[PDB]
Amino acid sequence: ASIKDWIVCQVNSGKFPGVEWEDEERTRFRIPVTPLADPCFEWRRDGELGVVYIRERASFKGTRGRRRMLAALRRTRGLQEIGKGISQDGHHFLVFRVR
């Protein structure tokens, strides 16, 4: 299926912390990208999604699973990287809008 439909489903499942909708109309979502060495790194948040992407679509080393997932997300026209930010807790994330 489409990678757009995939990530959207992961956001809608609510089983990945940080992988969440940002607005009430559910048109843009966040993707945790906190670096490994970052003190606030949290696997279930900044790593697990990347690995799930591999199972479904040696990628278990570091955050390579995520590194690949992002590439694919930044490639599909259905999505648009609109921004990023570090939350008050220190969690790094990206923001993608759905067209």
UniProtKB/TrEMBL annotation:
Signal peptide: none annotated. One of its GO terms (molecular function) is DNA-binding transcription factor activity, RNA polymerase II-specific. The chain holds residues 90 to 194 of 449 of the full protein. It comes from the Viruses. One of its GO terms (biological process) is immune system process. The gene is vIRF. Residues 1-99 form the IRF tryptophan pentad repeat domain. This is K9.
